Design an enzyme around this catalytic site. Structure first.
Site, PDB file in Angstrom:
ATOM      1  N   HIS A  54      -4.634   9.098 -14.242  1.00 25.21           N
ATOM      2  CA  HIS A  54      -4.544   9.020 -15.683  1.00 25.21           C
ATOM      3  C   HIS A  54      -3.245   8.252 -15.991  1.00 25.21           C
ATOM      4  O   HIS A  54      -2.267   8.448 -15.254  1.00 25.21           O
ATOM      5  CB  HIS A  54      -4.422  10.376 -16.388  1.00 25.21           C
ATOM      6  CG  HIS A  54      -5.566  11.288 -16.099  1.00 25.21           C
ATOM      7  ND1 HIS A  54      -5.565  12.177 -15.046  1.00 25.21           N
ATOM      8  CD2 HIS A  54      -6.759  11.447 -16.737  1.00 25.21           C
ATOM      9  CE1 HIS A  54      -6.715  12.835 -15.047  1.00 25.21           C
ATOM     10  NE2 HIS A  54      -7.463  12.417 -16.065  1.00 25.21           N
ATOM     11  N   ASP A  57      -0.401  10.462 -15.783  1.00 27.87           N
ATOM     12  CA  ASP A  57       0.059  10.964 -14.495  1.00 27.87           C
ATOM     13  C   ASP A  57       1.176  10.067 -13.956  1.00 27.87           C
ATOM     14  O   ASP A  57       2.052  10.532 -13.245  1.00 27.87           O
ATOM     15  CB  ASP A  57      -1.021  10.973 -13.415  1.00 27.87           C
ATOM     16  CG  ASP A  57      -2.175  11.866 -13.797  1.00 27.87           C
ATOM     17  OD1 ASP A  57      -1.914  12.885 -14.472  1.00 27.87           O
ATOM     18  OD2 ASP A  57      -3.321  11.551 -13.455  1.00 27.87           O
ATOM     19  N   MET A  88      -9.994   3.211  -9.180  1.00 19.58           N
ATOM     20  CA  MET A  88     -10.453   3.780 -10.445  1.00 19.58           C
ATOM     21  C   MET A  88      -9.226   4.216 -11.221  1.00 19.58           C
ATOM     22  O   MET A  88      -8.247   4.686 -10.632  1.00 19.58           O
ATOM     23  CB  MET A  88     -11.380   4.969 -10.219  1.00 19.58           C
ATOM     24  CG  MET A  88     -11.886   5.691 -11.461  1.00 19.58           C
ATOM     25  SD  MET A  88     -10.762   6.979 -12.065  1.00 19.58           S
ATOM     26  CE  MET A  88     -11.307   8.388 -11.102  1.00 19.58           C
ATOM     27  N   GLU A 181     -17.923  10.530 -17.617  1.00 17.88           N
ATOM     28  CA  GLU A 181     -17.912  11.746 -16.816  1.00 17.88           C
ATOM     29  C   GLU A 181     -18.295  12.939 -17.689  1.00 17.88           C
ATOM     30  O   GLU A 181     -17.494  13.315 -18.541  1.00 17.88           O
ATOM     31  CB  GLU A 181     -16.525  12.032 -16.240  1.00 17.88           C
ATOM     32  CG  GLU A 181     -16.418  13.357 -15.499  1.00 17.88           C
ATOM     33  CD  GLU A 181     -15.087  13.496 -14.782  1.00 17.88           C
ATOM     34  OE1 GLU A 181     -14.513  12.466 -14.364  1.00 17.88           O
ATOM     35  OE2 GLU A 181     -14.606  14.642 -14.661  1.00 17.88           O
ATOM     36  N   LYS A 183     -19.293  16.914 -18.764  1.00 17.85           N
ATOM     37  CA  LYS A 183     -18.929  18.295 -18.409  1.00 17.85           C
ATOM     38  C   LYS A 183     -19.512  19.153 -19.521  1.00 17.85           C
ATOM     39  O   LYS A 183     -19.452  18.718 -20.677  1.00 17.85           O
ATOM     40  CB  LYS A 183     -17.423  18.465 -18.274  1.00 17.85           C
ATOM     41  CG  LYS A 183     -16.996  19.901 -17.930  1.00 17.85           C
ATOM     42  CD  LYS A 183     -15.478  20.001 -17.832  1.00 17.85           C
ATOM     43  CE  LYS A 183     -15.047  21.330 -17.189  1.00 17.85           C
ATOM     44  NZ  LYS A 183     -13.569  21.494 -17.333  1.00 17.85           N
ATOM     45  N   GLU A 217     -19.647  15.020 -11.512  1.00 16.38           N
ATOM     46  CA  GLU A 217     -18.758  15.870 -10.720  1.00 16.38           C
ATOM     47  C   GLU A 217     -19.524  17.101 -10.242  1.00 16.38           C
ATOM     48  O   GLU A 217     -20.187  17.705 -11.101  1.00 16.38           O
ATOM     49  CB  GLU A 217     -17.535  16.330 -11.527  1.00 16.38           C
ATOM     50  CG  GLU A 217     -16.636  17.243 -10.695  1.00 16.38           C
ATOM     51  CD  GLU A 217     -15.272  17.432 -11.346  1.00 16.38           C
ATOM     52  OE1 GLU A 217     -14.627  16.414 -11.639  1.00 16.38           O
ATOM     53  OE2 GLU A 217     -14.890  18.594 -11.540  1.00 16.38           O
ATOM     54  N   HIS A 220     -19.095  20.309 -12.281  1.00 24.70           N
ATOM     55  CA  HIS A 220     -19.505  20.254 -13.689  1.00 24.70           C
ATOM     56  C   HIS A 220     -20.989  20.487 -13.847  1.00 24.70           C
ATOM     57  O   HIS A 220     -21.413  21.267 -14.718  1.00 24.70           O
ATOM     58  CB  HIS A 220     -19.111  18.906 -14.320  1.00 24.70           C
ATOM     59  CG  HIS A 220     -17.618  18.722 -14.413  1.00 24.70           C
ATOM     60  ND1 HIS A 220     -17.054  17.568 -14.913  1.00 24.70           N
ATOM     61  CD2 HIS A 220     -16.576  19.517 -14.072  1.00 24.70           C
ATOM     62  CE1 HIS A 220     -15.727  17.671 -14.873  1.00 24.70           C
ATOM     63  NE2 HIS A 220     -15.404  18.849 -14.380  1.00 24.70           N
ATOM     64  N   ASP A 245     -17.435  12.283  -8.255  1.00 25.18           N
ATOM     65  CA  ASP A 245     -16.306  13.172  -8.021  1.00 25.18           C
ATOM     66  C   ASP A 245     -16.727  14.391  -7.210  1.00 25.18           C
ATOM     67  O   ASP A 245     -17.659  15.083  -7.623  1.00 25.18           O
ATOM     68  CB  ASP A 245     -15.725  13.649  -9.348  1.00 25.18           C
ATOM     69  CG  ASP A 245     -14.868  12.607 -10.030  1.00 25.18           C
ATOM     70  OD1 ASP A 245     -14.663  11.508  -9.496  1.00 25.18           O
ATOM     71  OD2 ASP A 245     -14.407  12.891 -11.152  1.00 25.18           O
ATOM     72  N   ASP A 255     -14.268  26.318 -14.582  1.00 24.21           N
ATOM     73  CA  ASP A 255     -14.250  25.177 -13.658  1.00 24.21           C
ATOM     74  C   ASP A 255     -13.272  25.447 -12.527  1.00 24.21           C
ATOM     75  O   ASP A 255     -12.065  25.395 -12.778  1.00 24.21           O
ATOM     76  CB  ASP A 255     -13.881  23.939 -14.467  1.00 24.21           C
ATOM     77  CG  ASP A 255     -13.799  22.664 -13.645  1.00 24.21           C
ATOM     78  OD1 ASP A 255     -14.425  22.561 -12.569  1.00 24.21           O
ATOM     79  OD2 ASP A 255     -13.083  21.750 -14.124  1.00 24.21           O
ATOM     80  N   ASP A 257     -12.829  23.858  -9.391  1.00 21.66           N
ATOM     81  CA  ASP A 257     -12.239  22.728  -8.654  1.00 21.66           C
ATOM     82  C   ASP A 257     -11.803  23.112  -7.246  1.00 21.66           C
ATOM     83  O   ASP A 257     -10.687  22.795  -6.824  1.00 21.66           O
ATOM     84  CB  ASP A 257     -11.036  22.176  -9.426  1.00 21.66           C
ATOM     85  CG  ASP A 257     -11.494  21.402 -10.656  1.00 21.66           C
ATOM     86  OD1 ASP A 257     -12.688  21.027 -10.760  1.00 21.66           O
ATOM     87  OD2 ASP A 257     -10.641  21.206 -11.537  1.00 21.66           O
ATOM     88  N   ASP A 287     -11.953  15.358  -6.889  1.00 17.66           N
ATOM     89  CA  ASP A 287     -11.303  15.904  -8.087  1.00 17.66           C
ATOM     90  C   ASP A 287     -11.220  17.413  -7.895  1.00 17.66           C
ATOM     91  O   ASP A 287     -12.187  18.109  -8.205  1.00 17.66           O
ATOM     92  CB  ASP A 287     -12.123  15.530  -9.314  1.00 17.66           C
ATOM     93  CG  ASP A 287     -11.366  15.853 -10.597  1.00 17.66           C
ATOM     94  OD1 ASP A 287     -10.233  16.361 -10.463  1.00 17.66           O
ATOM     95  OD2 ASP A 287     -11.907  15.607 -11.690  1.00 17.66           O
TER      96      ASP A 287
HETATM   97 NI    NI Z   1     -13.949  20.239 -12.874  1.00 19.92          NI
END
Ligand code: NI
Ligand code: NI
Ligand code: NI
Ligand code: NI
Lengths: 388, 388, 388, 388
Positions: A54, A57, A88, A181, A183, A217, A220, A245, A255, A257, A287
């Site tokens: 991002h 980031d 990406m 993406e 979710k 993802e 998700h 992802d 979520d 992860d 991710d």
């Molecule tokens: Ni997630």
């Protein structure tokens, strides 16, 4: 007979994954922040192919144009030193309080214009760093209550946003494509374009559909209880899987992860089977979040685990499809017949074909067993390395 | 201030709904079968506009061409006697054991050809009875295990099936459109095209997309934990809501098919709000099951309840949108701004507009509250008839 | 290095599992019925230890006392011929329409008395056949709507039923214990005593608690999204795991009853780990359904698969706990410290211990990583047979 | 005919609810912090009866003994000025990184001793402020992976903790009781004692069970898809409902903490019906979060909404039970028969009663309809204020 990743395997990680400090809705950070340059270095040592980011980031929110240059130059130097790529990039349109009601579909028009400017700025940066795919996750586009958002107007606004972004990259001559993406929920009560299917449908309404695909993802789609490999197959069928992802999720809840391979292990097996069989050639992006119980040693252990579990599943799926007993079971279950046209002879011949109806023996057809359980136990034996 | 339905309200019911005998996976029928003619009569007395059918609801599987004629003629006479219409029909491709691995995407090619012939036969019947919409619910298209179905081949087969059906109605000059009905699971472990979004995306790949739309069902999207009103808004936005099925569901579990209004009552309120606001003009169809605890008196009570609860919600939603305090709260929450274009000035003016970025006061924007909770409590007061 | 079951492994199956004909809420039977005697024979050939039954699986509902004797005598002869045992039996209180509002907690008092007589009759039969455990699954005890059932009165009625059953077995001098089988929903909208925890709590209110324990089922706790191994550990801790039912479930949806090992494979691994580690010595019972896509060959393949997958997981869990690297990782994650008393020194010494609070270095404690991810990747490597 | 709360209504709020700053896993705080004294004042103005706190809500973590005294004295003065009470208090054992693997069941023994000292200190404070109930929510007791936690050892440790706490309050002569608050997941992958039933069962194993009950939360049982009113009825039946937490949740997903009345509105109706009917006399506590979209005006609007929606539901449930048509429908559905003993005549008379079995007309019983749908539509009409 081991499982070491190489940059040829195209494994990538977001800066925000191994750099997650462990803050969750009920607790403080348990780990210090990571310098992006150190993450790039540690990941290169683990065998990764590249990193993603991002905007926020990499460049702290509110940075002067020169601080920005400094941040980018150090990053670029770490990439040169390690050989890592940046395939990406994406925009943070969810952390700052200004995006509390969304970015592209916020009710406030001035916030939506700002969201587009923040995005365009980062697309230029991503093209400079060489990214080929620009991802959009509209984490704040949605609502907690029914009256707060007219969804037809919000889709108009979402389409407006993506059309303008496509006008911009075509006018600049940039070779980059977009990936949406989906979710279903969290952090909003319900998020717009909640599943792979909703995002695929939306794209067909854009001015230049060919510029956009999806970035699904694992966790998700599983938060909606859906079959992720089925979802990926539909995206492949539509020609729209531009990125993916990978992570783990234990069912329908927040979520999680988790590292890839954790969560639903059989779904992971069938996903790897499908990606390698369809010849998906983009990045294998993780991710995920190392649990906040961990220190930095557990962080790098968790990241290695992602890549290891993909390579083990890749080997078991390849062994499954190469096994002559499995190829015979596929024929016994008539997978070969599924791939043949129902009626290449055309409508008129079908209407005139009495064996399709008047003289079809429905009772004999119904008595044929599909033999799916033995096939599935062969797939299980192969996954567990129990082939005898 | 009461709630009696009239045929103008366009309420319809499937023969299979009030005629469900109460058989479930753990128990025997608790009610005798209903003659279609009696159902048509009882429903007409309750204020319904029309009925729908599967081929096998009306003509027993395996009927001779003449038994068929007899069944249809009695049905037609009941329609003439009551004024009831038949706006929609569909095919049963899920009950007979021959469809145990699906109809259009069964692995066995001869079953797929038979599925298409059974369908075409019923389309002719439906056009004769005047239906305008032909529904397809692929209840058996899917799998319990990963290797049993290649999903890209199955989508090829699904597209092949629907393209042929569209060739047939265009060659016959029939004015009827198709509507695909998604469901995520049950009776198969995972069903193909599991949500409204997946079906909308699929349609865009057909030869003549304009011939096909969706028939979403309240309980089906809720079995995936999704927001049904959001899903309906996306279908309306795409121009594809050709029909709708109403019922109730308490969360993520087996498909309950409760009467409309039961289950998630606030979702029902926001759905009615959206349908009446967007001017949806098709049938309001109820796909529901009177609980097997009930006798025939409870069956007709349950069917009346469906229509009553729609009319009560219609009145509360209309009162909500007409309330000047609510129109002011919508402005306070900036719903009016959501409906205005983000950038009708165009890309170049946006890029040159310094108030969109360089001089945007992000802190002042972020401090603006959205006022959504007061708006939502106004919506609650109106739903509960507690406006003071 | 193979996986053949022996009667020493204590694998058992219900007559209703391999004998399920394939009828589901949307379709007809796809398989003919099985004679109980043939099932007993086929299962003995596969390596099973015994079978279980509902009264109505063995003796058709409405049988004369003599037809009954005949049915039992043939069954007994098949048991003598094969060496198979009958360790558990149960009552069908859910299929007949008379139980549509429940058995022990039906609103109609005369139905509740009848439910108890039908039960008592089968307990005598089960003691004659040698069963040691009598299972109760109240599949119809519950409701689709809030007003239909006062739950405090229904629990009074449930307790009344179980107390009377306990009075009866103690007065007859029978050595048999009861096990309650929880399920959260299906076929009722919500079922009473929905999880292992609710059933454990209930039991503590019975007159003779020592006579009752639980019979948890993998898929049932997973239909509530719960961790089944955690649930089993709590039952073991309470001394109440009298029986267990094994199968597979893919998340929160209708009760799938897949073969054991299917569904959530990692949960299956941790369950087997716990059962073998705690020395559970009762039957390993499979309550599952061969998918209706299958013919009889797939039925026996599916049943073999249940036992095979247990034995493979047993071997991987045993290898995991015996691995010295794993024993060191358990110490690194402080599992050994979890097993030691927090305060065997007593309250007063704890209150006076300044290192527990005044001088506790909270920052140094917080910085210790738990090392759980490496431990979990070791568990994954072992499950996949990838230990290198 | 309005809905203003009074302190007689016993409505209470945690400091952490209206004082939540809006930080979620994907974003920054959107609101400034609230001084506890201001919250106490604003809530008193809204009609609330009292407030609750975690130790760390009131006294900042790491406070000197004197800063502590100052914080408490100001708080006490706000209580004196407003008349507000403090009926419940609890410990924060989840926010500080030291509790990342739990408090009472952390693997590290020194953390568990510290958790008990932090707790004991706050019990003294709560008794000084007059609380009658001490709540325990073990938000961090649990795991993300199977090997990280032996659940039988962790339950031993949990029991050890609660037994010591009970020894302490009995030795001090304090009149305070404990209430355990279950939650199935979040922030841990799975939390121990995940539902009301698991906590009720656990309590029966403590040295002094009479000292402990439950504090169930609407959204927590719904995150497992369970029926919250059913759960509350079981707790009332066991004599263990010592406190209750009210809020709203839309299905199985992350813990939303919406205002009470939001989420599943019919469940809220049946809950209020049960509490008022059983004469529950403890606090009506709201554990909720004003959405981060809101400013402080929306915060107080959201808190008012909680109390308003309880009072509206209270009035509709009271109208439902007082309606003679409803009392007749309850008799028609045989709720009166549910409350009568099945067999007050005793086992022997039941065994000898031929009308319970030999001569029971099972077919006539089965044909009786339960009339539940009309009853449920009467409950709906009353909830919507549509009684005509
Ligand atoms: Ni997630
Ligand atoms: Ni349905
Ligand atoms: Ni089951
Ligand atoms: Ni909560």
């Amino acid at each position: 007979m081991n499982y070491q990743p190489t940059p040829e395997d195209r494994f990538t990680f977001g800066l925000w994954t191994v750099g997650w400090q462990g803050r969750d809705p009920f607790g403080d950070a348990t780990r210090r922040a990571l310098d992006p340059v150190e993450s790039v270095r540690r990941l290169a040592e683990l065998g990764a192919h590249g990193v993603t980011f991002h905007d926020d980031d990499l460049i702290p929110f509110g940075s002067s144009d020169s601080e920005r240059e400094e941040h980018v130059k150090r990053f670029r130097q770490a990439l040169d030193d390690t050989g890592m790529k940046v395939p990406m990039a994406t925009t943070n349109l969810f952390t700052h309080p200004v995006f509390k009601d969304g970015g592209f579909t916020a009710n406030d028009r001035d916030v939506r214009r700002y969201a587009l400017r923040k995005t365009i700025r980062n697309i230029d940066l991503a093209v400079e760093l060489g990214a080929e795919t620009y991802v959009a996750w509209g984490g704040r586009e949605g609502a907690e209550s029914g009256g707060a958002k007219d969804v037809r107007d919000a889709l108009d606004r979402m389409k407006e946003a993506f059309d303008l972004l496509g006008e911009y990259v075509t006018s600049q001559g940039y070779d980059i494509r977009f990936a949406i993406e989906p979710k279903p929920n969290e952090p909003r009560g319900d998020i717009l374009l909640p599943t792979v299917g909703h995002a695929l449908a939306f794209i067909e309404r854009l001015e230049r559909p060919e510029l956009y695909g999806v970035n699904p993802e694992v966790g998700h789609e599983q938060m909606a209880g859906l079959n992720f490999p089925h979802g990926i197959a539909q995206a492949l069928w539509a020609g729209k899987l531009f990125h993916i992802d990978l992570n783990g999720q234990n069912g329908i809840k927040y979520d999680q992860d988790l590292r890839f391979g954790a969560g639903d292990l059989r779904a992971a097996f069938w996903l790897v089977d499908l990606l390698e069989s369809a010849g998906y050639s983009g990045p294998r992006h993780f991710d995920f979040k190392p649990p906040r119980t961990e220190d930095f040693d557990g962080v790098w252990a968790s990241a290695a685990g992602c890549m290891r579990n993909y390579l083990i599943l890749k080997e078991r799926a390849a062994a499954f499809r190469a096994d002559p007993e499995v190829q015979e079971a596929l024929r016994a279950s008539r997978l070969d017949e599924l791939a043949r046209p129902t009626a290449a002879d055309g409508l008129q011949a079908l209407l005139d074909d009495r064996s399709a109806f008047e003289e079809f023996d429905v009772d004999a057809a119904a008595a044929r067993g599909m033999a799916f359980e033995r096939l599935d136990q062969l797939a299980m034996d192969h996954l567990l390395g129990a082939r005898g």
